[PDB]
Design a protein around this ligand. Sequence first.
Ligand code: HEM
Ligand code: HEM
Ligand SMILES: *[C@@H]1O[C@H](CO)[C@@H](O)[C@H](O)[C@H]1NC(C)=O
Ligand SMILES: *[C@@H]1O[C@H](CO)[C@@H](O)[C@H](O)[C@H]1NC(C)=O
Ligand SMILES: *[C@@H]1O[C@H](CO)[C@@H](O)[C@H](O)[C@H]1NC(C)=O
Ligand SMILES: *[C@@H]1O[C@H](CO)[C@@H](O)[C@H](O)[C@H]1NC(C)=O
Ligand SMILES: CC1=CC(=O)CC(C)(C)C1
Ligand SMILES: [Mg+2]
Ligand SMILES: [Mg+2]
Lengths: 240, 240
Amino acid sequence: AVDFSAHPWKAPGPNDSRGPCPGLNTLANHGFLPRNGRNISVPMIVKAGFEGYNVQSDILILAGKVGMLTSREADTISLEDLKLHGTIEHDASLSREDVAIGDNLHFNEAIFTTLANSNPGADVYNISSAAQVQHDRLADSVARNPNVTNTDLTATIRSSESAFYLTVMSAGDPLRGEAPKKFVNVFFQEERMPIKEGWKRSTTPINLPLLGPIIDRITELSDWKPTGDNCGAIVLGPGL
Amino acid sequence: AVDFSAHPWKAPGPNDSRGPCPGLNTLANHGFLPRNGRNISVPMIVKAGFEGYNVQSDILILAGKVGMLTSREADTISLEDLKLHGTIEHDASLSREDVAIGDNLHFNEAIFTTLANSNPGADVYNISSAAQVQHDRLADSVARNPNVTNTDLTATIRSSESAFYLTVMSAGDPLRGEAPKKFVNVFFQEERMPIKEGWKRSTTPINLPLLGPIIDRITELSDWKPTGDNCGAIVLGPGL
Ligand code: HEM
Ligand code: HEM
Ligand SMILES: *[C@@H]1O[C@H](CO)[C@@H](O)[C@H](O)[C@H]1NC(C)=O
Ligand SMILES: *[C@@H]1O[C@H](CO)[C@@H](O)[C@H](O)[C@H]1NC(C)=O
Ligand SMILES: *[C@@H]1O[C@H](CO)[C@@H](O)[C@H](O)[C@H]1NC(C)=O
Ligand SMILES: *[C@@H]1O[C@H](CO)[C@@H](O)[C@H](O)[C@H]1NC(C)=O
Ligand SMILES: CC1=CC(=O)CC(C)(C)C1
Ligand SMILES: [Mg+2]
Ligand SMILES: [Mg+2]
C-alpha cells in the first residue's frame, strides 16, 4: 500500500511553515503533507492523516474545514495560520503557552513537563494520566492568564487532542487509550513518527466512533468546570 | 472575458439544489455556478461572484469557508446545505421563515412583503429602508418565534445581506447604498439577474471596504438591541 521508507523525517527548514499542531507538523516533517507546510487543503489533510496515522475522514473533514478559517486563502492554509487564537487554538495547550502570556505556536519543553511527568510508574500515558494533565494545564492557565478562555468547546477540543496522542501514537489497539511514553514524547518533542523506536501506523481506523468515548472519559476524569460566559463562539477569519 | 448573453436565466429543475441565499441561487440560475447547485467550492463561489456581480474575494472567501462547514464533504457544498440553522442561516430573514416555525429554505412572498413595501414613495430601496425592514423582521421573530435567536453575529450577518442587495442590484455606484425596487424584487422573487429590466453588473468592485460602512449604518438606523444570550457561536458542522 504505502511506504514509510519513502516518507523520511527531515527537520523543518527556516521557511517551512509549522503550526501549533504536532499531528500536522509531523505529517509535514515526513512529506505526507508538503514539507514547506504551505498551500495545504482539507483533501490533502484527509489523505495525509489516513496514510500517516489511519485517521479517518470524518474527524479530518470536520476539523479541517474549521482550520481553513484561519487563512485568507480560498481553500488552503499554511500550518502556521492554525495558531490563530480562538478558532481552534486555545489556552491550556499541552506543549504551547497561552497566547496572552507567551508563544502559542512553538513547542515548549517547560510546558510539556506536565505531560512528560504524567502517569508516574508506567511506561505509557493513558486516559487517567491525560485527564490529570488537562486538569493541571487548565489550573495553570487560570492561575497565570487573566484572559484565559475555557469553554465547553475548548474543553472538548482539548480532550480530542489528548485522545489523538493516545491513539495515533499507540502500540496496541488505539481503542485501549494508551500510548508508550517513548512514542508520544518523540511525537511532541521532535514532531517525528518514532519508527526507529518501534512505532507503526495503527491497523485499526481512528475515527469519531472510536475517539468519542475516549474524549468523554478524559473530560469526565478531568474534573472540568467552565470559565465565565462559557461562550463557544469561534473566530471566523483572520484580522477580525 | 465574461459574456452575460452566454449566461441565460433558467428556472431550477426539481433536483437542482437551491439554498436560502438569493445571491448564490441567482448565480446558479445563470450558470455562473453549476446549474445543479452541487459540488460547489469556495474558488467557484469567488469566481462566480466576481464574474456575476463584481463582488471581490475578500468577502466571498470569508463567507464561503463558513458556508463550507454546512456539508459533510471535504471542500464543497450543495447550495441547499447552506440552510443549516445556526451556521450562517438565521432567524428574521428578509424572504424566508424562521426554521422553528416554518420553511427557512425557500422564498416566501408573505415574508417578503415587509421588504417589498419598504421605502414608500420612492422607486429605490436604501439604507434607511433596509434598516426599518430589519427592525420589523426581528420584531416579527421576537413576536412569533419561541426559539428566536438574535445575537451581535446574526444582526451583523443580516446587515451584510441587506448591504448585498443594495449594492449588487444597484443601478448607480454601489457606494450610494440604493437599488431600484424593480431590480431587487426580481432578484428575490425570481432569483434572476434583471437584465431585461436594465440591470448591469457593477463596474465598481464590491468588497469589505465598500460594504463595511453601509453595514454599520444599516445596523445603527435599525435600533438593534441584544435580547438574550448574545453568544455568537456558530454551528461547526452538520448532524451535531
Ligand atoms: C491525526 C490528526 C491530528 C493529530 C494526531 C493532532 C494532534 C494534535 C495534538 C496532540 C494537539 C495538542 C497540542 C498541544 O496541546 O500542545 C493538537 C493541537 C492542534 N491541532 Fe491537531 N491533530 C490532528 C489534526 C488536526 C487538524 C486536521 C487540524 C486543523 C484542521 C488540527 C489543528 C490543531 C490546532 C489548531 C491545534 C492547536 C490547539 C492548541 O493547543 O491550542 N489538528 N493537535
Ligand atoms: C460567499 C458565499 C455566500 C454564502 C455562503 C451565502 C450564504 C447565505 C446564507 C446561508 C443565507 C441565509 C441567511 C438567512 O437569511 O437566514 C444567505 C442569505 C442571503 N445572501 Fe448570501 N451568501 C453568499 C453570497 C452572497 C452574495 C454574493 C449575495 C449577493 C447578493 C448574497 C445575498 C444574500 C441575501 C440578500 C441574503 C438574504 C436572504 C433573506 O434574508 O431572505 N449572498 N446567504
Ligand atoms: C493508567 O495507568 C496507571 C498506572 O499504570 C493506573 O493507575 C491507571 O489505572 C491507568 N488508567 C487507565 C484508564 O488505564
Ligand atoms: C466534483 O468536482 C470535482 C472537480 O471539479 C470532480 O473531480 C468530481 O468528479 C466532482 N464530483 C461530483 C460530486 O460530481
Ligand atoms: C431613502 O429614501 C427616502 C425616500 O426617498 C428618503 O426619505 C431617505 O432620505 C433615503 N435614505 C437614505 C439613507 O438615503
Ligand atoms: C422552543 O421554545 C419552547 C419554549 O416556548 C421550548 O419548549 C422548546 O424546547 C424550544 N425548542 C427548541 C428547538 O429548543
Ligand atoms: C461579516 C460577515 C458577512 C457574511 O455574510 C458571512 C460571515 C462569515 C458571517 C461574515
Ligand atoms: Mg494553544
Ligand atoms: Mg433565515
